CSV table of C-alpha atoms and ligand atoms in Angstrom, one decimal:
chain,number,residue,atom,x,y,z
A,1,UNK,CA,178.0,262.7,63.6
A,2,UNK,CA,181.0,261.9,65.3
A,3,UNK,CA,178.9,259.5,67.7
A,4,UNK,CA,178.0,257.5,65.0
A,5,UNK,CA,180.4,254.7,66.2
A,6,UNK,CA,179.7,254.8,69.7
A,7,UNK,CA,175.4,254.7,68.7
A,8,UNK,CA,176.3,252.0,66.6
A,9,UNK,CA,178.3,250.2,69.5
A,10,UNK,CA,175.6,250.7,72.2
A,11,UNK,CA,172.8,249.3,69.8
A,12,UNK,CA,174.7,246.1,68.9
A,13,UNK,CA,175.5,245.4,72.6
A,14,UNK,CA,172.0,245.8,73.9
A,15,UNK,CA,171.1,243.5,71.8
A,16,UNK,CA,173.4,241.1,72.4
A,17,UNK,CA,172.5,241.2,75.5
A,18,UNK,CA,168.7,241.5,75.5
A,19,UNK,CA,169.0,238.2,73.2
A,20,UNK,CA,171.8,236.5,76.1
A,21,UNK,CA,168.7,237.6,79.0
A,22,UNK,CA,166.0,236.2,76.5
A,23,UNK,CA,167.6,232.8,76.3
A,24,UNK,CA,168.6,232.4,80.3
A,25,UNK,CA,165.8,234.2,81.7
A,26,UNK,CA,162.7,233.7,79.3
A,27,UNK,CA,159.7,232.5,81.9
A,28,UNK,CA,161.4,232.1,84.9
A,29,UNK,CA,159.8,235.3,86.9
A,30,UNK,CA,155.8,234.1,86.6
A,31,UNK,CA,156.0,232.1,90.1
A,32,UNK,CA,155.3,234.1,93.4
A,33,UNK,CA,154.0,233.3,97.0
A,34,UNK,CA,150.3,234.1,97.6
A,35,UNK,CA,148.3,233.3,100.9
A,36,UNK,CA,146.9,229.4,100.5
A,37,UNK,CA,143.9,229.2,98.2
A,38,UNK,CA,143.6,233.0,97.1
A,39,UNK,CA,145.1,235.3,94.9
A,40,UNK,CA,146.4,237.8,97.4
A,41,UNK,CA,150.4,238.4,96.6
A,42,UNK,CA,151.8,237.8,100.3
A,43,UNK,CA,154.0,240.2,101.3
A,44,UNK,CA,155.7,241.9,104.0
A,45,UNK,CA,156.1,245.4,105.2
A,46,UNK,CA,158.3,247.6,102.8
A,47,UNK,CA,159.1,244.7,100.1
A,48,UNK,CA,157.6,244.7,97.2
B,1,UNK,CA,114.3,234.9,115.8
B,2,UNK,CA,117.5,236.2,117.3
B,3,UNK,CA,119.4,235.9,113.5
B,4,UNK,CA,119.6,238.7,111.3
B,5,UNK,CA,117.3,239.9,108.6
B,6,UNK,CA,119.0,238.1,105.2
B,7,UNK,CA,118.7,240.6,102.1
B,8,UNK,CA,119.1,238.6,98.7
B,9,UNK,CA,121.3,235.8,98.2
B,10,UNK,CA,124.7,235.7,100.2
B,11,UNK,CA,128.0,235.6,98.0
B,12,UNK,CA,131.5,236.4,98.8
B,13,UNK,CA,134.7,235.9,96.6
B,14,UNK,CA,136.8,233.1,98.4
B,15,UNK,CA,140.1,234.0,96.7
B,16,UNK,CA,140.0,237.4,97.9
B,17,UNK,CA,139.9,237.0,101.7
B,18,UNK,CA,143.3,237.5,103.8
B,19,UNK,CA,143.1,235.0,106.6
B,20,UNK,CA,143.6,238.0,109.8
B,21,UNK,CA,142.2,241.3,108.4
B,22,UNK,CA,138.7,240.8,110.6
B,23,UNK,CA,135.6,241.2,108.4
B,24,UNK,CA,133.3,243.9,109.9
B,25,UNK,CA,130.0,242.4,110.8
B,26,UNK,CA,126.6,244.0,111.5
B,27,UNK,CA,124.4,246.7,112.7
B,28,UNK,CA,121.1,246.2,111.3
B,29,UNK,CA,118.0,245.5,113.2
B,30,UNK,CA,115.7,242.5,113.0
B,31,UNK,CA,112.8,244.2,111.2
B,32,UNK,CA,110.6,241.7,110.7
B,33,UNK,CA,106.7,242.6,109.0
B,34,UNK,CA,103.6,241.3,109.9
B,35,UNK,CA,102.8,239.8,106.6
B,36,UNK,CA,106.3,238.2,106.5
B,37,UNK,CA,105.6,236.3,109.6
B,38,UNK,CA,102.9,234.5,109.1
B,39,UNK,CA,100.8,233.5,105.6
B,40,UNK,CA,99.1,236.4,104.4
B,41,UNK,CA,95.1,237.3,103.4
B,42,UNK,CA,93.5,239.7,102.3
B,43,UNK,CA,91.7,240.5,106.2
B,44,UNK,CA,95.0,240.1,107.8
B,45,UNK,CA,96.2,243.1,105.7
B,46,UNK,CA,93.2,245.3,106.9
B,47,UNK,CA,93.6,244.0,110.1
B,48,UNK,CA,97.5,245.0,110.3
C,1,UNK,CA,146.9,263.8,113.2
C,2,UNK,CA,148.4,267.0,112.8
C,3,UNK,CA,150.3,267.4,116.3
C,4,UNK,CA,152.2,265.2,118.7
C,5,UNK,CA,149.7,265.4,121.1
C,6,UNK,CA,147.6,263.8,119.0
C,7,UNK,CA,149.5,261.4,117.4
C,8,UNK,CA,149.0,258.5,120.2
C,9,UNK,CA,146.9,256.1,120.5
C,10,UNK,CA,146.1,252.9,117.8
C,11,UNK,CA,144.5,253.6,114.3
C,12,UNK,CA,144.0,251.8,111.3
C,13,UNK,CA,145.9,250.9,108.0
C,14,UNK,CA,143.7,248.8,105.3
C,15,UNK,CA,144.8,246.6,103.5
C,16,UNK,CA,145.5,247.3,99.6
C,17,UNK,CA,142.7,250.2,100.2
C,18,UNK,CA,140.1,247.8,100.9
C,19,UNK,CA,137.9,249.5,103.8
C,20,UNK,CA,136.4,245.8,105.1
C,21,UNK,CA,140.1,244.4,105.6
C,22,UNK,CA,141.7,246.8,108.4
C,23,UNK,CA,144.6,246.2,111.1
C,24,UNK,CA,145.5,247.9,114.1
C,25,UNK,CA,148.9,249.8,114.1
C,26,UNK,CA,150.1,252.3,117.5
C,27,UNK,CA,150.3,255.6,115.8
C,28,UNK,CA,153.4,257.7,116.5
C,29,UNK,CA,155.6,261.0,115.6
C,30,UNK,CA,158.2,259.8,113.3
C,31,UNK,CA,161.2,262.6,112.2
C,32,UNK,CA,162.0,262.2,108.4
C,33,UNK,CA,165.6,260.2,108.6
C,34,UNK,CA,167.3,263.2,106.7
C,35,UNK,CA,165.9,266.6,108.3
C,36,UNK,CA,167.0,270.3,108.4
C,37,UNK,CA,167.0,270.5,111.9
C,38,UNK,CA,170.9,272.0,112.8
C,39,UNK,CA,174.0,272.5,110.4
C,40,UNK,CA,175.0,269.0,110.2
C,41,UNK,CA,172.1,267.5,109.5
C,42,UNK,CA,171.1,270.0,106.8
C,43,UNK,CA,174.3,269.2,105.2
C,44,UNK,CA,174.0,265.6,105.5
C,45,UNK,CA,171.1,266.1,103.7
C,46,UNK,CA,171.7,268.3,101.3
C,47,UNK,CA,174.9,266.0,100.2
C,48,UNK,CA,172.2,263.1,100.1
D,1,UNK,CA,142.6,252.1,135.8
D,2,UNK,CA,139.8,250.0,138.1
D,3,UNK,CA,140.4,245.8,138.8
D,4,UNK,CA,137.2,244.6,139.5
D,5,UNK,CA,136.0,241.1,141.1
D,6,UNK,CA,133.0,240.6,138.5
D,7,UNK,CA,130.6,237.9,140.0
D,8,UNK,CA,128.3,235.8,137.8
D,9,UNK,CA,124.8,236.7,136.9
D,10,UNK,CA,121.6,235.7,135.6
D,11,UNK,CA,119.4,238.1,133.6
D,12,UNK,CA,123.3,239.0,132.4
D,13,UNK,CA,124.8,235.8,131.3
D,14,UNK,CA,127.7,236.9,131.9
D,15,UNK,CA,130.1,238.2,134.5
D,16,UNK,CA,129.1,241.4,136.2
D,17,UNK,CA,130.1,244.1,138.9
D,18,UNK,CA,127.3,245.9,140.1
D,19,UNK,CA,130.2,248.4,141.9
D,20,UNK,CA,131.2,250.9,139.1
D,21,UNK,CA,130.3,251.5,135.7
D,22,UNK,CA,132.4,250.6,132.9
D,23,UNK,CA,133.6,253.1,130.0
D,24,UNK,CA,133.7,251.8,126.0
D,25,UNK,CA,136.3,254.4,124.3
D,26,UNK,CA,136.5,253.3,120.4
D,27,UNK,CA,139.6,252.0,119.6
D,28,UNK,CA,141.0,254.6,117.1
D,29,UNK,CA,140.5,257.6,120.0
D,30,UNK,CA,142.9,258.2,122.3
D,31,UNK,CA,141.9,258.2,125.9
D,32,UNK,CA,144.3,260.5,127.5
D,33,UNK,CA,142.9,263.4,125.3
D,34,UNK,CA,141.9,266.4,127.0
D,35,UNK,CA,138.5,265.6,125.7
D,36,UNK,CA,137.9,262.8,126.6
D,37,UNK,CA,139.6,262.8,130.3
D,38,UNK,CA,137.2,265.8,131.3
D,39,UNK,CA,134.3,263.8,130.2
D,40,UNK,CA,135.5,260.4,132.3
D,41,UNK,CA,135.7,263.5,135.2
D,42,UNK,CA,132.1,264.5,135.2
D,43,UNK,CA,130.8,261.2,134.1
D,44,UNK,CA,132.0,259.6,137.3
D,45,UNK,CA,128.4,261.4,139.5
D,46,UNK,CA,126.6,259.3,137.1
D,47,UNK,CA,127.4,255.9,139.0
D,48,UNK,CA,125.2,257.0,141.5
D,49,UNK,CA,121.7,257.1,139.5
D,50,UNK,CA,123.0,253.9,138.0
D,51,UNK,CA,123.0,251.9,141.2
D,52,UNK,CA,119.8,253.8,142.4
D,53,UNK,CA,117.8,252.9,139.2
D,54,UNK,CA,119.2,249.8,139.8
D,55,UNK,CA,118.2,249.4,143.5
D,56,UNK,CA,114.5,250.2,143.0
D,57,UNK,CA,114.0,248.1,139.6
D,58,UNK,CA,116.4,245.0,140.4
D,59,UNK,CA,114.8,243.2,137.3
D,60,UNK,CA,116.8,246.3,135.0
D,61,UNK,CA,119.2,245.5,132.2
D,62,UNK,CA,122.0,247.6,130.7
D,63,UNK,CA,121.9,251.4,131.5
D,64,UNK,CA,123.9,253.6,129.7
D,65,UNK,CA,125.5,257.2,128.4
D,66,UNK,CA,126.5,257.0,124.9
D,67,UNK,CA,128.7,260.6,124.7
D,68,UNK,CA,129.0,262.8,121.9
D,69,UNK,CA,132.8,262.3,122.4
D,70,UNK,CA,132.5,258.4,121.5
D,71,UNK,CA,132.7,257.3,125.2
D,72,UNK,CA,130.0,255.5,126.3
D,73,UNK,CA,129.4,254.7,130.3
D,74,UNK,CA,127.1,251.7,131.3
D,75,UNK,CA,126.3,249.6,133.9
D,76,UNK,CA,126.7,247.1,135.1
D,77,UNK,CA,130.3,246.9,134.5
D,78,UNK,CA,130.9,243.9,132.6
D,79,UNK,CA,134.0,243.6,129.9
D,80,UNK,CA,133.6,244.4,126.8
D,81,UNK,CA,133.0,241.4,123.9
D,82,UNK,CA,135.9,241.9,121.7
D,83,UNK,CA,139.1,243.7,122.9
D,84,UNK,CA,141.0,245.8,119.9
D,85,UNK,CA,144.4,244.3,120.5
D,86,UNK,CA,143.8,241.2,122.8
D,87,UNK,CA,142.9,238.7,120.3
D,88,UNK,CA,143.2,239.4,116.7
D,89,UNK,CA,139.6,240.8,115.9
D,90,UNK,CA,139.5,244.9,116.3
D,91,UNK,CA,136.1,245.9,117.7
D,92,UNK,CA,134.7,248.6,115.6
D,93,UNK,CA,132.0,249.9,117.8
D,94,UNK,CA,131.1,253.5,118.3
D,95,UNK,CA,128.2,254.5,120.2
D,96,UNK,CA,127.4,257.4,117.7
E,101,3PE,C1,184.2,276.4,104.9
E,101,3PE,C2,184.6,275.4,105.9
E,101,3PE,C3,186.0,274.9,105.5
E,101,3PE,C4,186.4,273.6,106.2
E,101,3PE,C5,186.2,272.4,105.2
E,101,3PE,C6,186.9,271.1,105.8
E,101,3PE,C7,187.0,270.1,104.7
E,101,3PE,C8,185.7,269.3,104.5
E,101,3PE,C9,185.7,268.3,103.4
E,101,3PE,C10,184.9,267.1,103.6
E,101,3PE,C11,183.6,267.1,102.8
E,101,3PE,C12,182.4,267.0,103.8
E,101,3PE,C13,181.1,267.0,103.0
E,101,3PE,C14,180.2,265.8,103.4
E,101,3PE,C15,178.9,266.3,103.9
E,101,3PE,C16,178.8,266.4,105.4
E,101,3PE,C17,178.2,265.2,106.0
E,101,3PE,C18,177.9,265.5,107.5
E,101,3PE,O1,178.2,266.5,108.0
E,101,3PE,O2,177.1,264.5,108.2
E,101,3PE,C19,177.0,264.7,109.7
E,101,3PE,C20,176.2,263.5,110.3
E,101,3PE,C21,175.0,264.1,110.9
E,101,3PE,O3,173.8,263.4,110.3
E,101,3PE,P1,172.4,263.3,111.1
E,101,3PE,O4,171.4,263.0,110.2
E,101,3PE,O5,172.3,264.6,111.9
E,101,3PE,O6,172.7,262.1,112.1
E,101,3PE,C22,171.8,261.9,113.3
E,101,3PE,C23,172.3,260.7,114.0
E,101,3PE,N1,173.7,260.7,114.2
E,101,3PE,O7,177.0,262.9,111.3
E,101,3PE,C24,178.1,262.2,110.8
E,101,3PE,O8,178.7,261.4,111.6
E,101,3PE,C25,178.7,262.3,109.4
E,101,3PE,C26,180.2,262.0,109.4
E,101,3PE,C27,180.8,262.8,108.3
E,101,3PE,C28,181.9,261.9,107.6
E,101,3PE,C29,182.6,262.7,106.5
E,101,3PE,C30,183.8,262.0,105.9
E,101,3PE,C31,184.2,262.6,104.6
E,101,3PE,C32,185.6,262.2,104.3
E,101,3PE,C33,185.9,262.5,102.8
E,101,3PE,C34,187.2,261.8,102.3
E,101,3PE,C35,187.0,261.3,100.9
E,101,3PE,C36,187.1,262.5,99.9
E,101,3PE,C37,188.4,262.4,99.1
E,101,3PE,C38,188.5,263.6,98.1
E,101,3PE,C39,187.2,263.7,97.3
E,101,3PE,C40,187.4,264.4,96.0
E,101,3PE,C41,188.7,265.3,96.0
């Protein structure tokens, strides 16, 4: 019960900042590289 | 003919093909009937 | 290839686990990067 | 290993030394194995018969061992189609 402050702290700054990440970031993640005229994800060795 | 036997009707998915992965190929023989070289009667059968 | 003297020689990796899209690699006895071998390693190790 | 001179034929067209036999290993077995090095040891008298099966029939084709170790020893020598590392197309032949 003593963490009642901090649980309400933590909440209220994840959301801040999940709203902040919604509003600079929203649907800029969909474009990737692919091999010309397929839908194989071109990658190399150990990257993902 | 030298070609291969063709079984049903040839299809492949175009946008899942990596440009230098080398397809495997063949190792069937060209088993070609008697009744599916020429037209076929009803003596040619009894003949075969 | 469960010995060195195996492990030589080329083999094959396939692509996304798709057997008809296969590439050659040189096989060859690879020691893990943080081993138990003496003191100093096994401590590096462990403090990993 | 062997460098041969591999003249020009017909009845093969392609090029082909009637000297030594040549040896297919599959790509994805080690030559250098115990196995297969005492088989390229005992496969070597074989030569012989090829060139005198050859001399008597001159109008012969390919002759050849396929091994149960994968190897597989014909003649006329005459390199192979498609090399494993040489072009970009791995040959995935095995005589078994
Ligand atoms: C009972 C004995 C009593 C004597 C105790 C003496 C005091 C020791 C206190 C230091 C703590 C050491 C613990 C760290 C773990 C040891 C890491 C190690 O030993 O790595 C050795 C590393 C071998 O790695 P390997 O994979 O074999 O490499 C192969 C290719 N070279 O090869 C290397 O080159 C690793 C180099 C090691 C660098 C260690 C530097 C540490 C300095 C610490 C200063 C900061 C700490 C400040 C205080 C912390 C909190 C109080």
């Amino acid at each position: 019960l003593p963490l009642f402050h901090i649980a309400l702290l933590v909440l209220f700054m994840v959301i801040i900042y999940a709203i902040i990440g919604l509003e600079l970031f929203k649907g800029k993640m969909h474009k990737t590289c692919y091999y010309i005229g397929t839908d194989i994800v071109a990658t190399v060795e150990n990257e993902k | 003919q030298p070609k291969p036997i063709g079984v049903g009707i040839p299809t492949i998915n175009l946008r899942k093909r990596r440009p230098n992965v080398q397809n495997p190929k063949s190792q069937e023989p060209v088993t070609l009937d008697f009744l599916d070289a020429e037209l076929e009667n009803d003596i040619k059968v009894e003949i075969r | 290839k469960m010995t060195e003297e195996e492990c030589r020689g080329y083999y094959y990796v396939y692509k996304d686990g798709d057997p008809t899209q296969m590439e050659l690699r040189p096989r060859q006895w690879i020691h893990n990067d943080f081993h138990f071998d003496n003191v100093l390693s096994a401590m590096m190790s462990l403090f990993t | 290993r062997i460098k041969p001179v591999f003249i020009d034929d017909a009845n093969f067209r392609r090029q082909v030394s009637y000297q030594h036999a040549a040896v297919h290993i599959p790509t994805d077995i080690y030559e250098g194995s115990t196995i297969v090095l005492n088989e390229l040891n005992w496969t070597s008298a074989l030569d012989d018969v090829f060139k005198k099966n050859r001399e008597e029939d001159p109008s012969l084709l390919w002759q050849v061992f396929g091994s149960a170790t994968g190897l597989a020893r014909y003649y006329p020598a005459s390199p192979w189609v498609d090399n494993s590392r040489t072009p970009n197309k791995i040959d995935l032949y095995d005589v078994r």
